[PDB]
Design a protein around this ligand. Structure first.
Ligand SMILES: [Ca+2]
Ligand SMILES: [Ca+2]
Ligand SMILES: [Ca+2]
Ligand SMILES: [Ca+2]
Ligand SMILES: [Ca+2]
Ligand SMILES: [Ca+2]
Ligand SMILES: [Ca+2]
Ligand SMILES: [Ca+2]
Ligand SMILES: [Zn+2]
Lengths: 470, 105
């Protein structure tokens, strides 16, 4: 029967399911695309200037109140005074630039620094008299007197916007409000301080900040948990939404990119610097041989390389995801016992220390268990065909295991393996080979019974009959 | 627009968590002293009472943009109480009931 290892793989592959027909948390469940359409429901957007191949927007940091701040009531009925105006501090400006960059990284927009003043298409400023929330901004369908503006609350009672930093609320607020200025709405109809909106007022279940920084609701509402951290950059649904407006940025990170520890992204939110780093990010990558390096954590992790999939990394739940249309090739676990799930292409999976469970999936995968008792799982013979077999690069007989327990042939067909030296037209016959000289080995199986191997796994290190679980 | 993320000091004090209008109730003390391991703040009072509704006893908590989270030692959320209104946080029970957190007295 199916082993615990197989069940763990199967269970995580189906974790954080969305888009089904049944209700979730009393709400309809949306696919990434449906969520994107919903976020863009107001149909607001910037028009690319004539002669520009890509939308170009300048930004500036107000030095003094603009027309809107001086007489808000002339542009917004509800507001009479925004209190005391203050310019963005050096820290606020530096962080705003990182948030702007996180948006231009995923879609086709070129942001241009317009300095200090009111010359930018997008402007930033602080105010002290709350109008219901921590900040606000205007969609690009408003009159020029308000277009591109985002405002942030700062006073003796609220200091979250004073020191925005990687992973905190102040930084997400910048990313969120900037999102509005570019054309994104909250995933549902609600506004801070206006009435008493709750997650129950959401249009769809996935309206949480595990999927969109535009959401007002906690990631815990959908089962994720970032231990108090906040995504500093666009999430899964944000990426899909903004790309519907200005397209996918196919020039971004086309090199062999590493995310997590030892990152070469030069992006604070994609980088881990210690064993205590709380990572929260959605990967947008346009090409190359990429790796999710989570080697620096000790907690048991669950990593899923499929597009749109969420992973439990560094002790958090569903904090790492891969954007729709993105292909991440490799994954490196930490010192804990991890679950590494590959995708349809050839993946390099390294478990590291601990008793890991690796699942290459389709394609000829290079699997390293590392130290500890590791298990290499197969759920379909197509995952390691004789034509394109996986290679177990550090197999240790008596310690590691080749797990075929979930294969249909066994759990449903009741096939029994017969180890032989050569196929003779009998389904289930298997050949275990090993060359001491090259230290190379292999397992070949003829499931159909046509005397031809239809499943094979190459090995660097010997494997015996006892190392194979069925 | 963004929700105001209240500080621990903004919510600190004596609170009660009870099932609907039923007698089942627990007295809690939300403190604003930091707890590093849980990435939150100290939760005092009769926290042991909470095991009547939770798998383990939470001894830490933290404000969220639209609620209050009760935490296990490592920082994971054991219970998220959504803000229904000023000083009124609630969560739906597994069965069908509702737990309500309101300031004491
Ligand atoms: Ca890349
Ligand atoms: Ca790639
Ligand atoms: Ca694969
Ligand atoms: Ca490991
Ligand atoms: Ca091993
Ligand atoms: Ca290992
Ligand atoms: Ca494979
Ligand atoms: Ca065959
Ligand atoms: Zn907003």
């Amino acid at each position: 029967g199916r082993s615990d290892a197989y069940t763990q793989v199967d269970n995580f592959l189906h974790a954080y399911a969305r888009g089904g027909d049944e209700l979730v948390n009393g709400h309809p469940s949306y696919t990434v695309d449906q969520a994107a359409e919903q976020i863009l429901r107001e149909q607001a957007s910037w028009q690319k200037a004539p002669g520009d191949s890509v939308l170009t927007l300048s930004y500036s940091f107000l030095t003094k109140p603009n027309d809107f701040f001086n007489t808000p009531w002339k542009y917004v009925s509800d507001i009479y005074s925004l209190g005391k105006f203050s310019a963005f501090s050096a820290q606020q400006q530096a962080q705003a630039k990182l948030s702007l960059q996180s948006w231009s990284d995923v879609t086709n927009i070129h942001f241009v620094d317009a300095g200090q003043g009111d010359q930018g298409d997008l402007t930033f400023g602080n105010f002290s008299s709350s109008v219901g929330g921590a900040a606000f901004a205007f969609l690009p369908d408003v009159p020029d007197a308000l277009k591109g503006q985002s405002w942030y609350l700062i006073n003796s009672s609220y200091s979250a916007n004073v020191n925005p930093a990687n992973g905190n609320y102040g930084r997400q607020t910048l990313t969120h409000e900037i999102g509005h200025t570019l054309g994104l709405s909250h995933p549902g109809d609600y506004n801070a301080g206006e009435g008493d909106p709750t997650y129950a007022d959401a249009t769809y279940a996935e309206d949480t900040r595990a999927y969109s920084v535009m959401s007002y609701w906690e990631e815990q509402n959908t089962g994720q948990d970032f231990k108090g951290a906040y995504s500093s950059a666009p999430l899964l649904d944000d990426i899909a939404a903004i790309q519907k407006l200005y397209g996918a940025n196919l020039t971004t990170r086309t090199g062999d990119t590493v995310y997590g520890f030892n990152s070469n992204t030069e992006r604070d939110f994609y980088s881990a610097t210690s064993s205590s780093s709380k990572l929260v990010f959605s990967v947008w990558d346009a090409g190359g041989n990429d790796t999710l390096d989570f080697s620096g954590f000790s907690q048991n992790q669950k990593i899923n390389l499929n597009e749109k999939a969420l992973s439990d990394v560094g002790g958090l739940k569903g904090n790492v995801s891969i954007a729709a249309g993105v292909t991440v090739e490799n994954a490196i676990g930490g010192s804990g016992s991890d679950l590494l799930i590959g995708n349809d292409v050839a993946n390099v999976l390294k478990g590291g220390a601990g008793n890991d469970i690796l699942y290459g999936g389709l394609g000829a995968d290079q699997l390293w268990g590392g130290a500890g008792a590791d298990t290499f799982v197969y759920g379909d013979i197509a995952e390691s065909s004789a034509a394109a077999p996986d290679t177990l690069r550090d197999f240790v007989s008596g310690q590691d295991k080749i797990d075929l327990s979930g294969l249909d042939a066994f759990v449903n067909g009741g096939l029994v393996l017969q180890y032989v030296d050569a196929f003779a037209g009998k389904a289930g016959q298997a050949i275990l080979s090993y060359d001491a000289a090259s230290k190379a080995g292999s397992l070949a199986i003829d499931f159909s019974g046509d005397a031809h191997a239809d499943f094979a796994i190459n090995l660097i290190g010997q494997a015996t009959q006892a190392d194979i679980v069925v | 627009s963004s929700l105001i993320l209240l500080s621990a000091s903004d919510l600190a004090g004596q609170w009660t968590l009870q099932q609907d209008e039923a007698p089942a109730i627990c007295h809690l003390e939300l403190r604003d002293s930091e707890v590093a391991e849980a990435s939150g703040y100290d939760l005092g009072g009769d926290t042991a009472c909470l095991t009547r509704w939770l798998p383990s006893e939470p001894r830490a908590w933290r404000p969220t943009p639209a609620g209050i989270a009760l935490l296990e030692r490592g920082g994971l959320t054991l219970m998220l109480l959504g803000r229904q209104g000023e000083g009124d946080y609630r969560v739906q029970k597994g069965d069908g009931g509702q737990l309500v957190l309101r300031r004491a007295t």
